[PDB]
Amino acid sequence: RPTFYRQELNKTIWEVPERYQNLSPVYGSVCAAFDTKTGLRVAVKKLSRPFQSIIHAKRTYRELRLLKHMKHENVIGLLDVFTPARSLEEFNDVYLVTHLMGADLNNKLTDDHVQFLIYQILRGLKYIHSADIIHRDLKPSNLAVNEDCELKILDATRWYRAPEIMLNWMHYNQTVDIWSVGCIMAELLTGRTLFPGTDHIDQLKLILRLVGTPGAELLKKISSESARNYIQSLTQMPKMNFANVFIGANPLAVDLLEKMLVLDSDKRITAAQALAHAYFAQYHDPDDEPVADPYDQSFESRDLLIDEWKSLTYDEVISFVPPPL
Numbered sequence: 198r199p200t201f202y203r204q205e206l207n208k209t210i211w212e213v214p215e216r217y218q219n220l221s222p223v224y225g226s227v228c229a230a231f232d233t234k235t236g237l238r239v240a241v242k243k244l245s246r247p248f249q250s251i252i253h254a255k256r257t258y259r260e261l262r263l264l265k266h267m268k269h270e271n272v273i274g275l276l277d278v279f280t281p282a283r284s285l286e287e288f289n290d291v292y293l294v295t296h297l298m299g300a301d302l303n304n305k306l307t308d309d310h311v312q313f314l315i316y317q318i319l320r321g322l323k324y325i326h327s328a329d330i331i332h333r334d335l336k337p338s339n340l341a342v343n344e345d346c347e348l349k350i351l352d353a354t355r356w357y358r359a360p361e362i363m364l365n366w367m368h369y370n371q372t373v374d375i376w377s378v379g380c381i382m383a384e385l386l387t388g389r390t391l392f393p394g395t396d397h398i399d400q401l402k403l404i405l406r407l408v409g410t411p412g413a414e415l416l417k418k419i420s421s422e423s424a425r426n427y428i429q430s431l432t433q434m435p436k437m438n439f440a441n442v443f444i445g446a447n448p449l450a451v452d453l454l455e456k457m458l459v460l461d462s463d464k465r466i467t468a469a470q471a472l473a474h475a476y477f478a479q480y481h482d483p484d485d486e487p488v489a490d491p492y493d494q495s496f497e498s499r500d501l502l503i504d505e506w507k508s509l510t511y512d513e514v515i516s517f518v519p520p521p522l
């Protein structure tokens with residue numbers, strides 16, 4: 198339907214429609230560009246070798262499904278998806294289009310700013326979690342921020358992982374993301390990484406030091422004996438007073454962190470509960486914190502061939518409906 202034009206860039210090729218102009222660089226690579234149909238600055242990502250293997254093909258499929266489903270102000274939204282190919286037979290390259298944002302949280306703020314940024318992260322997690330989706334990798338690099346201070350969640354790394362991910366607990370839940378948020382918030386109030394471990398052992402040592410080693414009430418819920426010994430085989434440590442670690446920060450912020458950085462995931466506060474915490478007194482509006490439509494994750498359990506994952510992805514591309522301007 199539209200007209201495409203080839204181009205070299207990032208030591209890579211791009212055949213995009215002609216409505217996207219002025220490509221400029223910025224897993225797969227992202228480019229800045231100008232979208233003529235709406236006159237917004239957009240970001241265009243080209244997946245690298247989307248169907249090189251079964252795991253890749255499934256991930257490409259998973260990423261398109263997730264992006265096609267996200268419709269919320271604090272979560273990355275798909276503006277367009279396209280491929281140059283004319284036929285499923287010819288289909289080997291995938292590009293995704295989103296609102297360009299500029300900086301990351303990666304790039305010391307005031308308590309008012311922190312509130313607004315964490316608030317928006319929780320509003321987006323509430324949404325994402327209502328669909329049974331766990332992000333798993335929230336970090337400053339994955340939080341895009343515009344000049345207006347508006348934020349969207351997008352898709353070391355160990356520094357923000359919940360301890361039940363570090364130990365490969367097979368049955369972790371949604372509140373792994375709340376832990377990440379907890380480390381992020383801390384990093385914004387102190388300008389310092391909360392847990393800058395050097396490896397999966399150092400990392401945990403640092404966590405336990407702040408949160409204290411587990412109580413017998415938590416130890417009784419750990420199914421792995423390796424895990425258990427490894428843990429029980431460590432020098433007991435107590436919970437520190439968060440009011441003395443986060444010295445002079447808002448005592449409401451501190452309260453919120455105590456509730457996010459709990460070791461036991463079963464007692465960690467949720468996104469929806471945190472949004473009603475006092476720390477967000479001035480942003481919190483339960484009439485404007487929506488939840489998502491249900492998300493069919495049934496494919497996560499299937500074992501298909503590359504040619505099958507590739508064709509389901511093609512279908513998803515073809516059946517894309519842009520949002521309204």
Ligand SMILES: Cc1nn(-c2cccc(Cl)c2)c2c1NS(=O)(=O)c1ccccc1-2
Nearest residue numbers: 227240242273293295296297298351352
């Ligand atoms: C990590 C990242 N940055 N990143 C990105 C990089 C710079 C600006 C913006 Cl808005 C996003 C993206 C990504 N991945 S993504 O699935 O959220 C995505 C889809 C489409 C276009 C870019 C991204």
